[PDB]
RNA sequence: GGUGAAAUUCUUGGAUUUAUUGAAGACUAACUACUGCGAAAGCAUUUGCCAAGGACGUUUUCAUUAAUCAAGAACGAAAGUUAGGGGAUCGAAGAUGAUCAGAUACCGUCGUAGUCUUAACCAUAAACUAUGCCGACUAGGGAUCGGGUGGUGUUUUUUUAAUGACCCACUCGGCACCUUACGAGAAAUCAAAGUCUUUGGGUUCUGGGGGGAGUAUGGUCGCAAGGCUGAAACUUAAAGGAAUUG
């Protein structure tokens, strides 16, 4: 008897311009009223997006990005980075029977005071003539791999910010240097960064939000 | 020699009172009348003064705390959760 | 005749039996 | 209700508890790419014409 | 590309199905009906036919408001429960395809622990 | 670690134990390393920090109490501060 | 009369060159000769006096004020403490949980010491003795011994009388009874031995 | 009579392994025992793949698979036909088909 | 919701779902095996400390310092029990709703003690590999973990080098396995349950038909529940063990 789809508006969200598809989609609020604003009901939304749709490719579809609504500008609103996971089909589809699973996480606050807790998954693999059936790892080796992965993640994040982090996590260059950095201990297929998370935001940083946005 | 088998410091409570309550007061009298390790001076030199008051008698210090020991389980959880949340404030 | 309720009826046997001997003694 | 015509592709075999319901795959008589498994009551030969009250049930083995 | 996206969460369970539509955000839901609110038999609440009718009416409200292409998230009860989708989600997603809407980006989401709390039934089980 | 190489110091080189002898050696310039147990009062802690800033010696906060430092020097009592004159064999003076 | 001991704390008066003194119901861990920081912009230690807006969600604070400025009313007895529950930033109120399990919504500018009050664990030791309870009460107030109303006379209390010691009318006294009738179980929701839920 | 030389299933030289809950009835059965099957499904069934590929944007993208590793107990497995009881000799026939 | 189908209950004071954020506790799945480690009970997140430990290598060391164990001691799953601190999920007792000829039972919704932990008892299990422990010999095989050795072997790349991984062959130790029986067995079955009337390598416990009965009572331990020690009266011709046919 009220029918609120005569009330819900249409807002077009915009992504940081690290991603080639700046446009994503349109969310909806109820009416901008006195004492209760549509901007106020918009202040805290989190959007999950398939990184295939953002990058315009198809092979990159195994990832997902969490954007955070923080500012709105006149039927237009800007999003900020909040977290990254893989998708569950890919995480399970990697995890095989008969190989150890090297897995590590580290907490680090960046140059700007975003702290991030950042994860890295790598497996074991065969080597092209291995007649042994399974190929596990000694756990002292998995200790060495966690050490190297902790070093390389804290080095390739701590001296940067959200923008350079995004530019590193899109084309898979970190795990490229990881694979290249530990050919010399154990084989390790499927080296990946599976989960990054924002924990503590700095002060509101909306100038760097325009440094994401604002070109177009 | 051996004074008593199982009553300890509660020969001052005699044949009275019921053995159960003499158990609880045996344990808690051991606690509130035993010395403790002063972390401020590294000496086993503490005693109790009142509920809460724990004094170190060599380095002449005082510290508030549990009515029968230097610290309780509740205060252990309190110091850890304050340390956690203060760290994430720092972060 | 059967042994686990030899057992629980045995412990109740000993409970009733010990109480009544503690009455008389 | 837009009733659905169909045409028998091949039978599979009489199932159900008492045995008296066959399963046949049929093509919708206008969409040769779409055939579908379907429970039928009586006796079904090949290549004949079925009628359906719906097209999107495709019920399963019965016991 | 004049098609706008939404999210269809399909919660399949062995008592009921849920077909739920939100925006690209997570608050401000669009429209949800269930087979359990569709038919009245209390055991057909998780029927595939029930999820088919629920998907049809969610599609009706969805095309009436104008949402066209939808990211699908499908899941079970999960946790220490069943882990696995019942007879709902399959027929629901087929009916959502046969509706006339647009479906993309299906990935399973279902909540699953790193070894949660005890399951219910108590060590010897739901021995019936 | 630090315990092994401190045991190596007491084996080979030379030392002094105690606060008064430590500050006496530090005025006299015979010492190079000052090791402070972390349960020293902050006044005496920062006092020996000031004397180390005067004397250009190295200083290191032994992570524990003076009981742990007494175990680390092989004595059955507490040492608030232990001053390494020369290690003899340990590379502690080179590292850290 | 308390068990929870106190800290005579020496502050500096910012407006006149003197030493104004204050008495705190201490927490655990606080000690002689401790620098103690009070107010909003301070950092969250054990011993400091943050307000509830500037604590985060979920912090153990004791001697929590109830309304802004009234110098401490909640959670002050020997071993108590108030968990912060969860906020509402506009219309600035903070929800706390109170040592009776209570969920209260108090002023965000209410202060409080951080920690749990010293002298915890007091009531785990049996009194054992009329003598012990005698000195506990003769340093509080004259409410010990208590003679039972059923072992007085009928004139002295509504349970007295009889050739036995029994009461007769039901002993759950309502709230809309008058004075002189309220001596018993007062306006009871339920009686009897609680083999049941916390019901909150 | 000792029916199995493997007693159930394969400890052979531990002691205690952790127990695990049957999917159908939540019996806490130890993990060494307790029929394991790894079942994967496509999220859609075999008859709807052409339907969804006909009614999809983003042409020829992927089609992912639900994975699940269903644990089962003896009672639930034999009751629900994952396992059949086998002859005295083919008990040693350790081969899956 | 929940079920075999239902009802108990929760819901326009918005229940279930959605989203955001936080707290609280236990847990440590996917890796997960006919793999490891530990005296066993047992132990699966990272990282650090703390001390241990098996095996391997050894042209080191001492030179019988041993094997097995009555009394004796340590540890000892879980349930218990004594007070705390927690106490989320599951949850004996209890509540109901079902199912029933009845259901104080399985099924449903909750719910205390518990679950968790600190300090202290307890000392038991199908603690089961139902196979004492140390030794020597007796038969074929392929995978496996840990260490070693060799290879005109492979690979990583920056270039061969340094490994590290992989491959081939051996060796010690390890959890197992697959075939045959020379053998053993009452037999299922067994590389030890073999090397036994053709009877003896060192040694510790245990059983002597079934019930009675782990009861009696004496003793000791335990807060208690109960532990370890432990018969008799009388009764009965069986109790049984692998295997065949129905």
- Structure tokens that stand for A24 in this block: 């994503």
How far is residue A4's CA from residue A2's CA, in Å, rounded to a whole number? 6
Backbone φ and ψ of B73, nearest 5° = -65, -35
Q: How far is the CA of D1 from the C1' of I227 (A)?
A: 81
Q: How far is the CA of H10 from the C1' of I194 (A)?
A: 27
- Write out the DSSP string of B25-49: HHHHHHHHHS--EETTTTEE-EEE-
- Chain centroid, CA B26 distance in Å: 13
Exposure letters A117-147 (e unless 16+ CB within 10 A, then b)? ebbbbbbbeeeeeeeeeebebeeebbebbbe
Q: Strands, E, within F18-64: which ranges?
A: 33-37, 58-62
- Write out the DSSP string of G23-73: EEE-BSS-BSS----BSSSS---SS-B--STTS-SS-EEES--SSTTS---
Contact D53, D16 (CB under 8 A): no
Looking at residue E119, what DSSP letter applies? P
User: How far is the alpha carbon of F81 from chain B, nearest alpha carbon, in Å?
Assistant: 13
Backbone φ and ψ of E94, nearest 5° = -65, -40
- With CB atoms and an 8 Å threshold, state whether G118 touches B81: no
Cβ neighbour number for residue D63 with a 10 Å cutoff? 6
DSSP H/E element including A64: strand A63-72
List all residues of chain B from 12 to 41 with a beta carbon under 8 Å from chain G.
13, 17, 21, 24-25, 28, 40
- Chain centroid, CA E18 distance in Å: 4
User: Which residues of chain A does H42 touch, with a Cβ-Cβ cutoff of 8 Å?
Assistant: none
- Structure tokens that stand for E46 in this block: 């998780």
Name residues whose C-beta falls within 8 Å of residue C24's C-beta, 6 or more positions apart in sequence. none
Q: Quote the Cα angle for A64-A68-A72, to 5°.
A: 135
CA dist G145 → G63, G127, G141, G152, G154 (Å): 31, 14, 11, 14, 19
C-alpha Rg value of chain C to the nearest Å: 11
User: Residue G83 in 3-state DSSP?
Assistant: strand
How far is residue E61's CA from residue E68's CA, in Å, rounded to a whole number? 11
Q: Quote the Cα angle for G153-G154-G157, to 5°.
A: 90
From E69, E74, E94, residue closest to H57, measured CB to CB:
E69
The residue among F89, F93, F70, F82 whose CA lies nearest residue F16 is F82
Contact A168, A158 (CB under 8 A): no
Cβ neighbour number for residue G108 with a 10 Å cutoff? 18
User: Which residues of chain E does D56 touch, with a Cβ-Cβ cutoff of 8 Å?
Assistant: 52, 91, 94-95, 98
- Structure tokens that stand for E126 in this block: 């739901």
Name residues whose C-beta falls within 8 Å of residue F61's C-beta, 6 or more positions apart in sequence. F36, F38
CA dist H86 → A18, G92, H74, H82, H92 (Å): 62, 72, 14, 13, 9
The domain of H9 spans: 1-97
Contact A206, A9 (CB under 8 A): no
Q: How far is the CA of A137 from the C1' of I167 (A)?
A: 18
User: How far is the alpha carbon of B81 from chain A, nearest alpha carbon, in Å?
Assistant: 18
- Structure tokens that stand for F96 in this block: 């850290």
Name residues whose C-beta falls within 8 Å of residue H81's C-beta, 6 or more positions apart in sequence. none
- Write out the DSSP string of H21-71: E-TTT--EEETTSS-EEEEEEESS-TTSHHHHHHTBSSSS----EEEEEEE
Looking at residue A33, what DSSP letter applies? B
User: Which residues of chain E does H21 touch, with a Cβ-Cβ cutoff of 8 Å?
Assistant: 80, 118-119, 121
Cβ neighbour number for residue F36 with a 10 Å cutoff? 24
Domain chopping of chain E, boundaries:
1-128
Looking at residue A53, what DSSP letter applies? H
- Write out the DSSP string of E25-61: SSSS--EEE-STTT-SSSSGGG-HHHHHHHHHHHHHH
Sign of CA dihedral A45, A51, A52, A56: positive
* Nucleotide showing the shortest C1' distance to residue A123 CA: I31
DSSP H/E element including G137: helix G130-138
Q: What residues form DSSP beta bridges with A195?
A: A85
**How many structural domains does chain H have?**
1
Contact A70, A78 (CB under 8 A): yes
The residue among A138, A105, A106, A104 whose CA lies nearest residue A124 is A138
CA dist G56 → A108, B89, E112, G95 (Å): 21, 9, 29, 12
User: Which residues of chain A does H58 touch, with a Cβ-Cβ cutoff of 8 Å?
Assistant: 52-53, 58
The residue among A71, A153, A68 whose CA lies nearest residue A116 is A153
User: Residue G117 in 3-state DSSP?
Assistant: strand
Sign of CA dihedral G39, G43, G48, G49: positive
Give this entry's resolution in angstroms: 4.4
């Amino acid at each position: 008897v009220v029918d609120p789809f005569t009330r819900k508006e249409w807002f077009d969200i915009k992504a940081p311009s690290t991603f080639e598809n700046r446009n994503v989609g349109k969310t909806l609020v109820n009416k901008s009223t006195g004492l209760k604003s549509a901007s106020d009901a918009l202040k805290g939304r989190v959007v999950e997006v398939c990184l295939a749709d953002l990058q315009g490719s198809e092979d990159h579809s195994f990832r997902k990005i969490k954007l955070r609504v923080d500012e709105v500008q006149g039927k237009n609103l800007l999003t900020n980075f909040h977290g990254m996971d893989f998708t569950t089909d890919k995480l399970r589809s990697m995890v095989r029977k008969w190989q150890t699973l090297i897995e590590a996480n580290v907490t680090v606050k960046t140059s700007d005071d975003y702290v991030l807790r950042i994860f890295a998954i790598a497996f074991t693999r065969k080597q092209a003539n291995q007649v042994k059936r399974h190929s596990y790892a000694q756990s002292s080796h998995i200790r060495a791999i966690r050490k190297v992965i902790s070093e390389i993640l804290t080095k390739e994040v701590q001296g940067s910010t959200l923008a350079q982090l995004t530019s590193k996590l899109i084309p898979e260059v970190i795990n490229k240097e990881i694979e290249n950095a530990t050919k010399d201990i154990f084989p390790l297929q499927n080296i990946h960064v599976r989960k990054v998370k924002l924990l503590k935001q700095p002060k509101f940083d909306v100038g760097a939000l325009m440094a994401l946005h604002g070109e177009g | 020699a051996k004074r008593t088998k199982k009553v300890g410091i509660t020969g001052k409570y005699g044949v009275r009172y019921g053995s159960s309550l003499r158990r609880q007061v045996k344990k808690l009298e051991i606690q509130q009348h035993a010395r403790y390790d002063c972390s401020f001076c590294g000496k086993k030199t503490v005693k109790r003064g009142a509920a809460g008051i724990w004094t170190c008698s060599c380095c002449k210090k005082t510290v508030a705390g549990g009515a029968y020991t230097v610290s309780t389980a509740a205060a252990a959880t309190v110091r850890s959760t304050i340390r956690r949340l203060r760290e994430m404030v720092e972060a | 005749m059967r042994a686990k309720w030899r057992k629980k009826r045995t412990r109740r046997l000993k409970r009733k039996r010990r109480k009544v001997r503690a009455r008389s003694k | 209700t837009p009733v659905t015509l169909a045409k028998v592709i091949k039978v599979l075999g009489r199932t159900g508890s008492r045995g008296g319901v066959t399963q046949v795959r049929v093509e919708f008589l206008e969409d040769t790419s779409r055939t579908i498994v379907r429970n039928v009551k009586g006796p079904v030969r090949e290549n004949d014409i079925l009628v359906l009250m719906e097209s999107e049930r495709e019920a399963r083995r019965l016991r | 590309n004049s098609q706008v996206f939404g999210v269809a969460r399909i919660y399949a369970s062995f008592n009921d199905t849920f077909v739920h539509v939100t925006d690209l955000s997570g608050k401000e839901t669009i429209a949800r009906v269930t087979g359990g609110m569709k038919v009245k038999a209390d055991r057909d609440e998780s029927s595939p036919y029930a999820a088919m009718l629920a998907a049809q009416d969610v599609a009706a409200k969805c095309k009436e408001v104008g949402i066209t292409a939808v990211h699908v998230k499908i899941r079970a009860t999960g946790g220490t429960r069943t882990k696995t989708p019942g007879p709902g989600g399959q027929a629901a997603l087929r009916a959502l395809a046969r509706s006339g809407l647009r479906i993309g980006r299906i990935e399973d989401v279902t909540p699953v622990p790193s070894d949660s709390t005890r399951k219910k039934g108590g060590r010897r089980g739901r021995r019936l | 670690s630090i315990n092994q190489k401190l045991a190596l110091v007491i084996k080979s080189g030379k030392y002094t134990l105690g606060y008064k002898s430590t500050v006496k050696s530090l005025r006299q310039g015979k010492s190079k390393l000052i090791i402070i147990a972390a349960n020293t009062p902050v006044l005496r802690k920062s006092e020996l920090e000031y004397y180390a800033m005067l004397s250009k010696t190295k200083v290191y906060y032994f992570q524990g109490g003076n009981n742990e430092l007494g175990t680390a020097v092989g004595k059955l009592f507490r040492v608030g501060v232990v001053s390494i004159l020369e290690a003899g064999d340990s590379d502690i003076l080179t590292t850290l | 009369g308390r068990g929870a001991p106190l800290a005579k704390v020496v502050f500096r008066d910012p407006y006149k060159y003197r030493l104004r003194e204050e008495i705190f119901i201490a927490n655990e861990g606080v000690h002689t000769g401790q620098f103690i920081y009070a107010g909003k912009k301070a950092s969250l230690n054990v011993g400091n006096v943050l307000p509830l807006g500037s604590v985060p969600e979920g912090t153990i604070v004791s001697n929590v004020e109830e309304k802004p400025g009234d110098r401490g009313a909640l959670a002050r007895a020997s071993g108590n403490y108030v968990i912060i529950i969860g906020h509402n930033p506009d219309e600035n109120k903070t929800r706390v949980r109170l040592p009776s399990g209570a969920k209260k919504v108090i002023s965000s500018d209410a202060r409080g010491v951080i920690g749990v009050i010293a002298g915890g664990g007091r009531v785990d030791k049996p009194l054992l003795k009329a003598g012990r309870a005698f000195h506990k009460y003769r340093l509080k107030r004259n409410s010990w011994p208590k003679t039972r109303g059923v072992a007085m006379n009928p004139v002295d209390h509504p349970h007295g009388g009889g050739n036995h010691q029994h009461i007769g009318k039901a002993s759950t006294i309502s709230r809309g009874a008058v004075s002189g009738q309220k001596a018993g179980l007062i306006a009871a929701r339920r009686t009897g031995l609680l083999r049941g839920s916390q019901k909150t | 009579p000792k029916k199995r030389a493997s007693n159930g299933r394969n400890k052979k030289g531990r002691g205690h392994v952790k127990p695990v809950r049957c999917v159908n009835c939540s019996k806490s059965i130890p993990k060494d025992k307790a029929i394991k099957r790894m079942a994967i499904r496509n999220i859609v069934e075999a008859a709807a793949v052409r339907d969804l590929s006909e009614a999809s944007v983003y042409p020829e993208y992927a089609l992912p698979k639900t994975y699940n590793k269903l644990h089962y107990c003896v009672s639930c497995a034999i009751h629900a036909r994952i396992v059949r009881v086998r002859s005295r000799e083919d008990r040693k026939n350790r081969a899956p088909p």
